[PDB]
Design an enzyme around this catalytic site. Structure first.
Site, PDB file in Angstrom:
ATOM      1  N   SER A 185       0.832  -1.198   0.000  1.00 56.32           N
ATOM      2  CA  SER A 185       0.000   0.000   0.000  1.00 56.32           C
ATOM      3  C   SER A 185       0.869   1.251   0.000  1.00 56.32           C
ATOM      4  O   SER A 185       1.936   1.273   0.614  1.00 56.32           O
ATOM      5  CB  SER A 185      -0.927   0.010   1.217  1.00 56.32           C
ATOM      6  OG  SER A 185      -1.592   1.255   1.346  1.00 56.32           O
ATOM      7  N   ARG A 186       0.414   2.291  -0.692  1.00 53.38           N
ATOM      8  CA  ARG A 186       1.148   3.549  -0.739  1.00 53.38           C
ATOM      9  C   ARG A 186       0.984   4.318   0.569  1.00 53.38           C
ATOM     10  O   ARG A 186       1.966   4.610   1.253  1.00 53.38           O
ATOM     11  CB  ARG A 186       0.694   4.404  -1.926  1.00 53.38           C
ATOM     12  CG  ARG A 186       0.963   3.774  -3.285  1.00 53.38           C
ATOM     13  CD  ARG A 186       0.742   4.771  -4.415  1.00 53.38           C
ATOM     14  NE  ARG A 186       1.734   5.842  -4.401  1.00 53.38           N
ATOM     15  CZ  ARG A 186       2.885   5.803  -5.064  1.00 53.38           C
ATOM     16  NH1 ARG A 186       3.193   4.746  -5.801  1.00 53.38           N
ATOM     17  NH2 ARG A 186       3.729   6.823  -4.992  1.00 53.38           N
TER      18      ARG A 186
END
Lengths: 484, 466, 53, 358
Positions: free
Chosen positions: A351-352
Site C-alpha cells: 500500500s502507498r
C-alpha cells in the site's frame, strides 16, 4: 409532425448497434427509446447518421423503426433508498422487493473531486483480515487493487471486508459507519445470487448495495455498471458519510467497452482495446477520494478487482489499473494450495498510504512484521541444511508467523483481537510452540483474554493506541498463557 | 399463412444477402428458407444492412446457390421439436431426425433463441454430485444442478472422459439426459450412439432415456455456431415444462465460440485479440446463462472445453472458466506419468470445496492432499540438481510420488487403451482412504496404489509383490 | 582435510556458476523482451490489417 | 445478354471481376475466351469475383466469359491407378487419356453419423515405432506434424511401399490402394518420388494428384479435395484407399492468397476466417463406412509443417484438433540417431489397440 429533431428512423441495425437517421438535437451519451420498447444510448454522433448502442436484444429493433429522445444523459437514482437492494446497471430493481424511493438522481459520468477539496488519508478501513490490516493497511479514500488469478480468493477477500463492517454499521455513530457497494460486472447470475444469500446469512446485506451487470445483459450495461455504482456510493461521500465500493471485476468491464468500440468502427489499440481504455478506468477510480473537512470529510474507498491470466501482471489492462491504484494486494495460487489463506505475496503487495491509515495500536506491534517476512522469504530456501545463529532464529519466527496469518473465511477479527496475536508473534512469545497447535492457540488465547483480561481488550478497542503501562500489561497477559 | 418473398442479392462463401420489399423485412434471429433441388437451405437473419436488405448466416454450405433465388421467411427463429418424443432420436441444428427413423411426432416446437432466467428465478443450491473418479470426486466435486466443465487440448482424452461419466452418472440419474455434440469428431460421435444402444440407454422400440443433438465439425460455421442452442432448447423444455431433473452434456463447447470466430470476420467485424470475435463474453453469456437451476427444475451441465495449444490464456478457455461452478483441467503432462485420468490436481478447483458442504473431515483431508503436492513443483529444482538427499519435509516430499499415483482410477469404458479392468470408488471411501496415507501406508514404494479401487483394493495389490 | 578441500572447492565451483548463471538470466532476459515487443506488434498488425476491410 | 455471359470489369493476380453472369451458381466453373478456366466464389450484387486457374495476361478488359453449368468435378475410378493427374483430374504424365468411370464432385459432404463403423482394421506401415506405439487405422486420421527436413514425407512414403504385400495378393479386401496429394511442392520432387515408387513396383496401386507450387493458387486449393474424391470411389465401392496430404500447410497458404485477393477480411496470421473449416470438411471425408454401405474405408495421413518446433502455432493447432492422432517428428531426435524421429511423449493414437494386430 415528424421533424427529425426528436424523432429518428433506423437506417440499419445489427451487431447490437443501430445506425439511426435524424435525432438532430441530441446530446452525446444520451438515451433513446425504440418502438419495440427496449432503449439505448447514443455514442457516435456522425454527420448524417447517429450510432446507438442497444441495451437489449437487437432482434427487437428493425430497419425503419421509430426512435424517440429521452432528453436524459445516463443517470441513476441515488440515496439511502438503495441500502439493502439489488439493482441492475440502470438503478432498476431486480430482487422483487418493489420500487425504490430515490433521494435524487445523478449522472453515470461524474467529474472526479478536484485537487483542493481532498484530505490526507488518515481514517482506516479495517478489513478484519490479519494479513491485510497488518501488512497492507487500506485507508479511507484510498484505492487498493485486489489483483490476482482465477479462483485464488480475490472475491473472498473483498467479501470478508464487507463482513467486518458490522462492528460499526450496527452502531449509532455515523462517522464510523461504512456503507458498501458491490458491483457485479460479468459474473453469472447464479454467483451474484449466491453472494447475496451469503451476505444475508451475516446480516451485512442490510448496509450493502449490489449492482448487477451479468454476462447475459448487454455490453453497454456492463460498461456503465461501475460508473453507475460509483454514483450510488458517491452519494454517501457527498453527505459526510463513508462508502466502500468493490468492482468485481474491472477486467471484464474493459472487455465490454472493447466489444462496444470494436463494433462502433473505432480505431483499435494494443490487444484490440480502444485508445481510451486507460481513460475509462482512470475516470472511474479517480472518483474515489477522501474529501477535505471543508465540504464533509466523507470518503469513497475503492477496491477494484483484476483477473490476471497465468499470473502475468505486465499485460495492457492489468498494468494500466495498477498505475492508478494507491497500492496492490496480490494473491498467488502457489500459496493458496500450500495452505496460506489469504494467499498474499507481501513481496509485491504494498500500500502507498500504508502506516498513516492504520490503527496506531496495530502499527506499534507490527512495525517490523513487514520486514521480518520480507527477509524470511529469501532465507526460506536455506531449508535445503545447517543453521548458525543469525539465521537460526529467523527461520524459527516466520515459520509460525505466517502460520498465524492464516485466517479462515467469514471470520473477520476486530483490531482488538489482532494486536494480542501480533504482539505474541513479533516479540516472540510463540517461537517455542509446535506449529500443529498454533491454529488452536489463536482461539483458546482469545477466549482466555475475553474471560480474564476483558479490560485489556476494551482499552485497545476504545483508545486504539498502546500506552507504556498498557503494552507492558500486554506482555504479562501473554507470558501467563504461555505457561498453561 | 402469409408467405414473404425475397431475392438473394449476393453470396460470399457462407454469408448470404437477401433482399425484401418495404416494411416486410424479417427480424434478426429469424429463419429464412430456400427451396433447392436437393432439399432445403436454411438461413439465419443476422443484420439489417439498409435499403430493405438483410444479411444472413448459412446453416448449410451454400455451394450451388443461384443469385436472385426466392427466399421464404418462416416468421421466427429456427423452431426445433421439443418434448418427450425427442428422446432416443438424433436431430441436427435445424431440427430433423438424422437417425433415419421417420419424422418426430412432436407436439410443440420452441425457438432456439430464448432469454435466460431472470435474477429472481434463480435457485441457490449446493448439492454434491457423486461421480466415482477419485482424483475428481475428492479434490474437485461435481455439483448437482451446477455447471461442471473439463478443459484441455487435443490428446488429453476428453471425449473418452465424458464417456465414463455417462455410464456411471447418467444411468444412476433419475431423469432426462441431453447430449449435444458441437464441432467434434463425427466418428467418435458415432461410437457414442453405438455404445449407448448396447448399454440399454437407447431402445428403438422401448424406453429412450437420452436425446441426441449432433452438428459435427464437417458442417459449415453457421450450423456449428447454433447447434449448441438446439440441444439447449431441448433440455430446457425438460427443466421447466416437464418439471424433472435434467442432465446436459456439451462436446465440444469450444467449437461454439470457434464457430462464432469464423463468421465474425465474414459478417464484417473488426477482429479482436488473438483473432477472435469482438462479441465473446456476451455470446458465451447468452449461452451459459440458460444452463442454470431454477425454481421449476434443475439442470446439471457437463461441458467439454478444448484449449488451443494447451494455452490456458486463450480467450476461449478464459471466458468459459468464469461460468463453471466446478472444473476438471486436463493436462498433457499428467498422462505421460501413467496416472489416469490426466487430471491436474493444481488447477481443478470446485466451489463446493467448503467445510460446510462436504463435511469438515472431507475438507480437512482434501487440504492435506493439496499441501503435499505444490511443494514439489517449487522444490523440484533441488531434485533436478541433486535429488532427494538435501531434503530435511523429507517425509512429505516422498508422499508426492505415492499420493499422485493413488489418484489414478481404472475404467471399463477405456478397455482398448490399457486392457486393465476398471474400478469405481464412491464418496466416503476415498476420504477415509487418503487420511490413513496422510505415512502409515508408507511401507510399499511405487506400485500398490497404482490403478486400484478404494483402500481394500490397495491391500490386494500389495500382496502380489512386483 | 579431504572434505575440507572439497568445501573450499565447492565455493569456487559455484562462484563461477552464479556468475555463469548471470550470462543467462540477463542474456535470455533481453531475448524475452525482443519477443515481447514482437508479440504485441504482430498481435496488433492482424487487427489493423483486418480493420481496413 | 448477361444471363449466361459476362464482360471483365477488371483482372489481375489471378483475380477477375466480371459484370453479368446473372444466373451463375456459386462455386461454378467458368471458361474464358482466351482459353483460361476460372471459378466463381463471390456473387456480389454488382459484379462477380472469379479466381483464374491459369495465367493473367490471357484475360483483358471487356473479355467475354462463358458459363460451364458445372460445379468443380473430377473423373474417378480404377483407371487413375498408376497415373499422375493435376488438380483438375487431367493426366500430366503424358500417358494418354484416363479411363473415366464417373465424375464425383470436389466438394463432397462427409458421411453422416449413421453409416459408420468403429475403426478396427490396422494399417501396417512396416515401421516399428509407428505400428508398435501409434498404429494407424482404416478410416482413421493420423497427422504427421513436424518441421522441415525431419523426414515427414519419408514416414508417409514408406507406408505406401509396405502395402505391396497385400496389393499383389488375391484377396481384394486386404488391399489398400494409395493416393498422394503433392501440394506446394516443386515438380522436380514429385518426379523423384514417382521414380522411387516404380522402383519398388508401387505405382501400379497408387494414384498421384500433384498441384505443384508453380500451378495457380486455386489449383493447390482444390488439390486435396479433388484428391479425396479420387480415394472416395474406393471407399464408396467396398475397397480401401489411403490418402496422404503433403503438404497441407501449403494448401492453407494458397487459400489465404485467394481470400486476400478477393478482399475477404483476414483473421489470425492473415489467414481467412474459415481456415479451420478448410481442413475440417476435408479430413472428415476420410472414414470407415458401415457394413450396410460396404465397409469401405478411407485413411487420411495429413502432413503439416511447423516453424521452430512450434505446435502452438495457429494452423498446426487446427489440424491437430481434427485428426484422431499425431506423429510429432522432432529434429533433435533426428540427428541424434533416432529415425524416424518420433517423439513418444507428444505422439498418440486415439484409436489405439482397437485397430492393431492382436
Amino acid at each position: 409532425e415528424a421533424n427529425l429533431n426528436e424523432t429518428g428512423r433506423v437506417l440499419a441495425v445489427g451487431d447490437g448497434i443501430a445506425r439511426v437517421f435524424g435525432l438532430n438535437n441530441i446530446q452525446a451519451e444520451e438515451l433513446v427509446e425504440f418502438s419495440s420498447g427496449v432503449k439505448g444510448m447514443a455514442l457516435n454522433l456522425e454527420p448524417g447518421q447517429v450510432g446507438i448502442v442497444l441495451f437489449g436484444s437487437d432482434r427487437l429493433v428493425k430497419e425503419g423503426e421509430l426512435v424517440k429522445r429521452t432528453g436524459n444523459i445516463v443517470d441513476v437514482p441515488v440515496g439511502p433508498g438503495l441500502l439493502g437492494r439489488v439493482v441492475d446497471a440502470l438503478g432498476n430493481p431486480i430482487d422483487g422487493k418493489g420500487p425504490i424511493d430515490a433521494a435524487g438522481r445523478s449522472r453515470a459520468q461524474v467529474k472526479a473531486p478536484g485537487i483542493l477539496p481532498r484530505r490526507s488519508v488518515h481514517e482506516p478501513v479495517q478489513t478484519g483480515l490479519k494479513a491485510v490490516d497488518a501488512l497492507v493497511p487500506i485507508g479511507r479514500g484510498q484505492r487498493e487493487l485486489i489483483i490476482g488469478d482465477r479462483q485464488t480468493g480475490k472475491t473472498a477477500v473483498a467479501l470478508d471486508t464487507i463482513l467486518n463492517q458490522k462492528r460499526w454499521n450496527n452502531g449509532s455513530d455515523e462517522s464510523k459507519k461504512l456503507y458498501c457497494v458491490y458491483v457485479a460486472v460479468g459474473q453469472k447470475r447464479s454467483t451474484v445470487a449466491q453472494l447475496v444469500q451469503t451476505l444475508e446469512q451475516h446480516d451485512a446485506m442490510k448496509y450493502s448495495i449490489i449492482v448487477a451487470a451479468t454476462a447475459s445483459e448487454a455490453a453497454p450495461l456492463q460498461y456503465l455498471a461501475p460508473f453507475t455504482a460509483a454514483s450510488i456510493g458517491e452519494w454517501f461521500r457527498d453527505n459526510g458519510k463513508h462508502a466502500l465500493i468493490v468492482y468485481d471485476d474491472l477486467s471484464k468491464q474493459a472487455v465490454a467497452y472493447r466489444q462496444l468500440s470494436l463494433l462502433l468502427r473505432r480505431p483499435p489499440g494494443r490487444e484490440a482495446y480502444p485508445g481510451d481504455v486507460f481513460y475509462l478506468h482512470s475516470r472511474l477510480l479517480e472518483r474515489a477520494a477522501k474529501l477535505s473537512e471543508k465540504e464533509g470529510s466523507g470518503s469513497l474507498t475503492a477496491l477494484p478487482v483484476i483477473e490476471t491470466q497465468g499470473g502475468d501482471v505486465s499485460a495492457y489492462i492489468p498494468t494500466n489499473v495498477i498505475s492508478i491504484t494507491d497500492g496492490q494486494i496480490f494473491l498467488e495460487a502457489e500459496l493458496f494450495y500450500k495452505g496460506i489463506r489469504p494467499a498474499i505475496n507481501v513481496g509485491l503487495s504494498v500500500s502507498r498510504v500504508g502506516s498513516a491509515a492504520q490503527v496506531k495500536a496495530l502499527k506499534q506491534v507490527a512495525g517490523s512484521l513487514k520486514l521480518f517476512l520480507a527477509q524470511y522469504r529469501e532465507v526460506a530456501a536455506f531449508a535445503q541444511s545447517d543453521l548458525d545463529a543469525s539465521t537460526k532464529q529467523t527461520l524459527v519466527r516466520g515459520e509460525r508467523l505466517t502460520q498465524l496469518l492464516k485466517q479462515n473465511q467469514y471470520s473477520p477479527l476486530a483490531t482488538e483481537e489482532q494486536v494480542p496475536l501480533i504482539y505474541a508473534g513479533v516479540n516472540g512469545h510463540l517461537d517455542g510452540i509446535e506449529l500443529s497447535r498454533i491454529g488452536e492457540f489463536e482461539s483458546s488465547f482469545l477466549s482466555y483474554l475475553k474471560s480474564n483480561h476483558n479490560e485489556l481488550l476494551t482499552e485497545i478497542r476504545e483508545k486504539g493506541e498502546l500506552s507504556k503501562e498498557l503494552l507492558a500489561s500486554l506482555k504479562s497477559a501473554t507470558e501467563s498463557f504461555v505457561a498453561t | 399463412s402469409t408467405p414473404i418473398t425475397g431475392k438473394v442479392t449476393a453470396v460470399i462463401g457462407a454469408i448470404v444477402d437477401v433482399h425484401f420489399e418495404q416494411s416486410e423485412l424479417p427480424a434478426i434471429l429469424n429463419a429464412l428458407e430456400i427451396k433447392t433441388p436437393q432439399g432445403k437451405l436454411v438461413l439465419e437473419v443476422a443484420q439489417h444492412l439498409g435499403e430493405n436488405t438483410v444479411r444472413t448466416i448459412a446453416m448449410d454450405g451454400t455451394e450451388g446457390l443461384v443469385r436472385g433465388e426466392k427466399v421464404l421467411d418462416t416468421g421466427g427463429p429456427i423452431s426445433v421439436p421439443v418434448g418427450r418424443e425427442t428422446l432416443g432420436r438424433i436431430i441436427n441444428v435445424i431440427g430433423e431426425p438424422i437417425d433415419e427413423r421417420g419424422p418426430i411426432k412432436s407436439k410443440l416446437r420452441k425457438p432456439i433463441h430464448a432469454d435466460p432466467p431472470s435474477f429472481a428465478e434463480q435457485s441457490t443450491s449446493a448439492e454434491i454430485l457423486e461421480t466415482g473418479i477419485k482424483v475428481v470426486d475428492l479434490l474437485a466435486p461435481y455439483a448437482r444442478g451446477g455447471k461442471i466443465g473439463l478443459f484441455g487440448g487435443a490428446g488429453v482424452g476428453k471425449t473418452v472422459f465424458i464417456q465414463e461419466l455417462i455410464n456411471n452418472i447418467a444411468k444412476a440419474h433419475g431423469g432426462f439426459s441431453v447430449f449435444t455434440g458441437v464441432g467434434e469428431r463425427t466418428r467418435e460421435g458415432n461410437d457414442l450412439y453405438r455404445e449407448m444402444k448396447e448399454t440399454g440407454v437407447i431402445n428403438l422400440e422401448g424406453e429412450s432415456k437420452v436425446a441426441l443433438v449432433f452438428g459435427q465439425m464437417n458442417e459449415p460455421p453457421g450450423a456449428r455456431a447454433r447447434v449448441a442452442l438446439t440441444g439447449l432448447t431441448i433440455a430446457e423444455y425438460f427443466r421447466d415444462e416437464e418439471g424433472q431433473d435434467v442432465l446436459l452434456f456439451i462436446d465440444n463447447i469450444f467449437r461454439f465460440t470457434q464457430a462464432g470466430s469464423e463468421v465474425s470476420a465474414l459478417l464484417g467485424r473488426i477482429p479482436s485479440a488473438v483473432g477472435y470475435q469482438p462479441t465473446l463474453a456476451t455470446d458465451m453469456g447468452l449461452l451459459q446463462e440458460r444452463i442454470t437451476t431454477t425454481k421449476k427444475g434443475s439442470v446439471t451441465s457437463v461441458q467439454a472445453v478444448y484449449v488451443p495449444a494447451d494455452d490456458l490464456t486463450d480467450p476461449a478457455p478464459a471466458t468459459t472458466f468464469a461460468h463453471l461452478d466446478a472444473t476438471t483441467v486436463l493436462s498433457r503432462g499428467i498422462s505421460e506419468l501413467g496416472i489416469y485420468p490426466a487430471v491436474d490436481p493444481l488447477d481443478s478447483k470446485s466451489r463446493l470445496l467448503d467445510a460446510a458442504v462436504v463435511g469438515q473431515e472431507h475438507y480437512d483431508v482434501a487440504s492435506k492432499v493439496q499441501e503435499t503436492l505444490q511443494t514439489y513443483k517449487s522444490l523440484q529444482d533441488i531434485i533436478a540438481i541433486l535429488g532427494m538427499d538435501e531434503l530435511s519435509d523429507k517425509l512429505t516430499v516422498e508422499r508426492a510420488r505415492k499420493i499422485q499415483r493413488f489418484l489414478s482410477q481404472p475404467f471399463a469404458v477405456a478397455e482398448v487403451f490399457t486392457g486393465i479392468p476398471g474400478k469405481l470408488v464412491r464418496l466416503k471411501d476415498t476420504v477415509a482412504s487418503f487420511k490413513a496415507v496422510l505415512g502409515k501406508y508408507d511401507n510399499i514404494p511405487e506400485h500398490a496404489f497404482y490403478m486400484v479401487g478404494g483402500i481394500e483394493d490397495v491391500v490386494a495389490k500389495a500382496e502380489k509383490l512386483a | 582435510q579431504g572434505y575440507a578441500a572439497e568445501i573450499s572447492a565447492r565455493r569456487n565451483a559455484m562462484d563461477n556458476a552464479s556468475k555463469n548463471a548471470g550470462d543467462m538470466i540477463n542474456r535470455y532476459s533481453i531475448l524475452y523482451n525482443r519477443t515481447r515487443q514482437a508479440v504485441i506488434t504482430n498481435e496488433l498488425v492482424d487487427i489493423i490489417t483486418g480493420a481496413s476491410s
